[PDB]
Design a protein around this ligand. Structure first.
Ligand SMILES: OCCc1ccccc1
Ligand SMILES: OCCc1ccccc1
Ligand SMILES: [Mn+2]
Ligand SMILES: [Mn+2]
Ligand SMILES: [Mn+2]
Ligand SMILES: [Mn+2]
Ligand code: NA
Ligand code: NA
Lengths: 331, 331
């Protein structure tokens, strides 16, 4: 693969640069932003907030972000394109299905879902021509029957297009294993797959075993932590009580185990968030004022301090994402 | 003195013969725009709807109430386009059915009240097309979230005068619990239509609600799986009662003295993604008359059963007008 699709069109692999592989402009629901923009103040407000945030990550060195919002996460491709242009940051859009598919999606066959993911990757999202550059799927423990279909279609779409698959997992419950199993049963190469939210578990055995099989490990919840918000139940349930340092150390752990080439790091950040309790955005923003710039501003330096060499840091933030994102077909 | 339609306000007299429970398309939020090909094409769907609407219009139908909420995938722009092309008044709805995504399910009664008000008072999305009715629903005992929706719908009705219409599990007598919730909010039964009432032969249930002042929605008349007993999905959706059995409910209610509380419709559609693939073809085979079924078959049937002309006119013109007319409670 020589080109990556973005909301502004295709870019060469070199242009991706420093990339955050699991982010979001807005965490919502299909049709939500268009139907009730005031939930976020306004569309304009949300976009402005987004541009500010993207500009700041950009100042910090982020060149590209992969917005893993699916149809069901309320991905609004027009919004992504507008802010990408305004902030001058590349944004890779996604196809796939998250865990909140409406009936029209939930009643579909693997064949049907495959054609829909294909539509989004090959032709374009909605009527925009904006093509997806990644497939997002998810499980939250053992897969439901529908989710197994989603996983299968995702693999089929990946096999046909060469674009990678990235996932949401209930890390502590080892969902990556079931995911992998399904992917493999469809003939997908582990190298086209990123098992996400992997920093949510302290089980290094689980992660190294997956890495050992060739999977990419997404350590994408680094700044997520409710330490200092124990009183806030929902926030606690969302962010956990492990420190950012603890999560970040997993990156070092995997590097020390020999898997530096299989690590993807991000913040799983957003500018609007409707798919959870009201006011959770404010809470998050308090917890992590750096937002998407958290990786380059705090994690990179923390790792270097811990002994990780520059070249390794560079490989993880630049080389890894480039290899992953480059559309690659099975030989 | 005015009813809001997708083409603007109309005078109570312009509504004429009205179908109070219909859909242009039965889908999911954002589905039609993300995967129009599911219906062949957006253009195909529009044309189909225009043909059907022209045909019902030929039959005497002047207005249809499209009870598709945000979660049924209502696409007001499509409603407007087809209304204009077929020259049939179409009343849009707000409310929430039974497939709300997370962004909706996590909301409070207060937030949902503001969303329903936005759609009624200001406009749907950015179109300024104002909803003329509030659609809600339960499928058996209401869920906690569903109770909140019913309460918000009552609040919105009390503030705007726009009526509330519901989807029920007639079998389970959902209408009683709905009425309960509505009344606890101070809503007048005369602003409420208890839907899919013809799905049950319990004349006790129906007359008990009519007695309190509710409007009874006999809108599934043409739904019958007779002759397709072998199609599990269809029988499940359509039932095995004949259209005449359902229609006879109208006469029964008339006979029991509640002719002013009856609303009749077909609950038809031109696209249906929220169910198994091909259901639309099965339905169209069952009732080729589509929306025209009420005037072409239902009205004449009743008339032959002794129902008088003026009562027929009363039910099809008078009742809907009174129901649709925004009405604020006395103070
Ligand atoms: O040898 C290549 C150096 C590199 C480091 C970490 C991950 C990607 C590449
Ligand atoms: O005035 C009696 C005429 C009428 C009959 C049916 C429904 C509403 C009105
Ligand atoms: Mn996630
Ligand atoms: Mn995410
Ligand atoms: Mn219904
Ligand atoms: Mn309906
Ligand atoms: Na493509
Ligand atoms: Na209004």
């Amino acid at each position: 693969g020589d080109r990556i699709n973005t909301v502004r069109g295709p870019i060469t692999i070199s242009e991706a640069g420093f990339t955050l592989t699991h982010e979001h402009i807005c965490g919502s629901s299909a049709g939500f932003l268009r139907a009730w923009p005031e939930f976020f103040g306004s569309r304009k407000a949300l976009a402005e907030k987004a541009v500010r945030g993207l500009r700041r990550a950009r100042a910090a060195g982020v060149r590209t972000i992969v917005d893993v919002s699916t149809f069901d996460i309320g991905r609004d491709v027009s919004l992504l394109a507008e802010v990408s242009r305004a902030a001058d940051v590349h944004i890779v859009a996604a196809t796939g299905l998250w865990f909140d598919p409406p009936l029209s999606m939930r009643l579909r066959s693997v064949e049907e879902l495959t054609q829909f993911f294909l539509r989004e990757i090959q032709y374009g999202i909605e009527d925009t021509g904006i093509r997806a550059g990644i497939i997002k799927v998810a499980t939250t423990g053992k897969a439901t029957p529908f989710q197994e279909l989603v996983l299968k279609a995702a693999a089929r779409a990946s096999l046909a297009t060469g674009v990678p698959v990235t996932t949401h997992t209930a890390a502590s419950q080892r969902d990556g294993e079931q995911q992998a199993a399904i992917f493999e049963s469809e003939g997908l190469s582990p190298s086209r797959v990123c098992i996400g939210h992997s920093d949510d578990t302290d089980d290094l055995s689980y992660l190294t075993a997956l890495a050992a099989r060739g999977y990419l490990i997404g350590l994408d919840h680094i700044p997520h932590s409710a330490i200092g918000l124990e009183d806030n139940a929902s926030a606690s349930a969302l962010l956990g009580i492990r420190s950012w340092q603890t999560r970040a150390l997993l990156i070092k752990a995997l590097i020390d185990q020999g898997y530096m080439k299989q690590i993807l790091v991000s913040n799983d950040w957003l500018f609007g968030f409707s798919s959870y309790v009201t006011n959770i955005m404010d809470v998050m923003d308090r917890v992590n004022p750096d937002g998407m710039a958290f990786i380059p501003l705090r994690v990179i330096p923390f790792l270097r301090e811990k002994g990780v060499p520059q070249e390794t840091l560079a490989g993880i933030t630049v080389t890894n994402p480039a290899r992953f994102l480059s559309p690659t077909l099975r030989a």
